[PDB]
């Protein structure tokens, strides 16, 4: 499971130059760090 600075490294790797979208604190840590998430779930945190 990805957590902390190790997580945001994979997030910047998956999105790459695409970026991250932005626009109830059960966030990505409670999704990809508390539990195991695949890279398809990570990619949905990127931009269009």
């Amino acid at each position: 499971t990805l957590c902390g600075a190790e997580l945001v490294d994979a997030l910047q790797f998956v999105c790459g130059d695409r970026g991250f979208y932005f626009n109830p604190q059960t966030g990505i840590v409670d999704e990809c760090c508390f539990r195991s998430c695949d890279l398809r779930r990570l990619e949905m945190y990127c931009a269009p």
């Binding site: 695949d38 890279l39 398809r40 990619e43």
Partner: protein
Amino acid sequence: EICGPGIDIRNDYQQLKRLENCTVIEGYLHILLISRSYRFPKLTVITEYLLLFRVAGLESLGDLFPNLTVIRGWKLFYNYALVIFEMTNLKDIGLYNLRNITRGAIRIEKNADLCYLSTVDWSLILDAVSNNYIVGNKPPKECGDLCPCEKTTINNEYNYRCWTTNRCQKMCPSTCACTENNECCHPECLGSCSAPDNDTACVACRHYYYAGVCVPACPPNTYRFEGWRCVDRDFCANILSAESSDSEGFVIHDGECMQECPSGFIRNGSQSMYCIPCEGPCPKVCEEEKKTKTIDSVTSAQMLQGCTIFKGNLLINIRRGNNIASELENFMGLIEVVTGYVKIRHSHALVSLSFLKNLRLILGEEQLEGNYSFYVLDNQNLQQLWDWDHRNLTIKAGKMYFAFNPKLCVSEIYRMEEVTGTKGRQSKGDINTRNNGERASCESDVLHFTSTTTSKNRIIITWHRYRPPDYRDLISFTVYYKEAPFKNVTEYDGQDACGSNSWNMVDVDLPPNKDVEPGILLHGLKPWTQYAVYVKAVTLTMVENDHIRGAKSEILYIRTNASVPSIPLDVLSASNSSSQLIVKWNPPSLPNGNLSYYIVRWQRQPQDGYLYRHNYCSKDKIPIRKYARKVFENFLHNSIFVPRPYPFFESRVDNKERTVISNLRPFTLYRIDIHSCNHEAEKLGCSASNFVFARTMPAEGADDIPGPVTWEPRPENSIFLKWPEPENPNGLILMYEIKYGSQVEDQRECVSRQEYRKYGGAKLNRLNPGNYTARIQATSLSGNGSWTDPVFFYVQAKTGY
């Protein structure tokens, strides 16, 4: 003197006196939590395991059991035949007569004063020496393993072998099972010998033992008991297993005398000393002390879980409850034979007795007053029995009484006595039409469906308009739908009017306009899923005519349209070799149709561009990238203490969820996209991608220098080394290291990759004159290469002719 079937000495030091007469201990032996001199030369054999734990004052095991020879380990303590754990003051394993441990391994742990561990060759005492566990004792470097004899090879060393500081480790000659001094025992013997090669002069018998003789197999009229001796037929007829409600004697089977018949066997009637082979799943007969088991709750029915035959009577009286039809069916669904009667009284929650499925026999040992074996009374919601044309039933003796069951159609219980076999056995008042079938709608009309329209999650279904039998009746409809994997679906699957076990119910009214027919739109359904749908009419009759009709439709099976499948689940990848990548995954969560094949894609990933710029002779850490006792203490504590009460390449995997990619650049990252199609993916399109990243194995020997190193003198007292660059490195060559020196290659030079790209080599500047040797090593992303062959160069003290 045999002692057993289990010795557990603890607390009192003086409680150890129970071994004063025992020469053989049948079962295990526990000497636990013990806090003077006690000697037991009688004991020689222990059938199961031996456990020692926190015995204060004991310095050596030879003080207690000097003649202990064989620990057979018939039953093991966590796969161990001898456990010496947390033994304080203990200095050595003084079992200098121990010869053979037949089965399990050894665990000697946490003995801060224990010596003579490596002085014991456990390879000639037991067999599974690999699975032993000797950790946490007094370190052999900080002990003093001294002998006062023989020796052999232990691991890779050869050293003496002794049990304690006075006794050695006794061994048999290569000619042989031997006596005290060089005379081979009997083949059926084991350990030592009171006399050479005699059956009646053996300290311990291998295989089996009977009447003072070490016999291979038991005599004809004797059977195997425990794992070392043979007993006769009358002995096991006097043994009694651990006391329970269903505790009985021991059985004789396969020439063995065990506690209970093995799996797939049951005890024979009358002749209850032998096991008869039951072919099906052998029954689990449940015997309860109370004469009539009353099931007034789901918690009360729990005691009937997994029962096949019930020796007693069943009294069902379930007023309230939870989800009951699926719950009782878990407990009572396996009951097949009831020895007595069955009474369903006041069971208002029960709309059907279908939870008693495999019940195919009701005898009649005891019958209710009036000779009744099936007695139901006051069941305000019992619409149907479990007697549909699929199930079988046979009441051997007794009558049937039915009263005050309003929702039960009287025709259903007439159909019961056909299979039951008690047609003309009951009286005229046992089955009465007055208080039974009062609110029941037996003969009902047929609602006909008209059209069905299916999408991936919505279903539109309409049925014909229904004119009630009377003009005044107010009419409404109710749609029953549920996900059914296959067709064997009955209309009765819930409990009372609250049984939300299965059918989803929606009340749709008759439309006002008479030209449009009643229908319903279902929303939020799983794509490609067979749904069982049927409509029931709600006829509220103003004139309460007891000629109740009603309307009910046929069970219609409707499957929704396929959709895009889900992403594959848990994509894992590894690399067993260079230019190869193995990938495995799971089928998608929602296939949404029949799976046809998988489409996997792999794309070359570029090497990191930031890696090429930095000079790595200054950085301390160079980046590397890759390819592809507590649990025993819990078991010992849980048993001892008892409380008192780049382009994409695409390929299709036809059947399996695993594939191997071939022809790849070694030590290169790859993106692995995996898709999941179905039978309708030709029009809908294949699913999305659950992707993963994996790097191949490094090409072995490809990140070293591919040629010889050349040298040329330079100004000052310098030497310019020149060597070729590896053509195909494992990723990228980061830096080179030169190892040079006059007599010993002491001086070391770091050559960065940027420095090599300019000069093609490195210049060792300003050296003292003399002969030199040099070696160069390339460090790639996977690791370093091999050093080159030494090149020889000289530095002249005066550069001249």
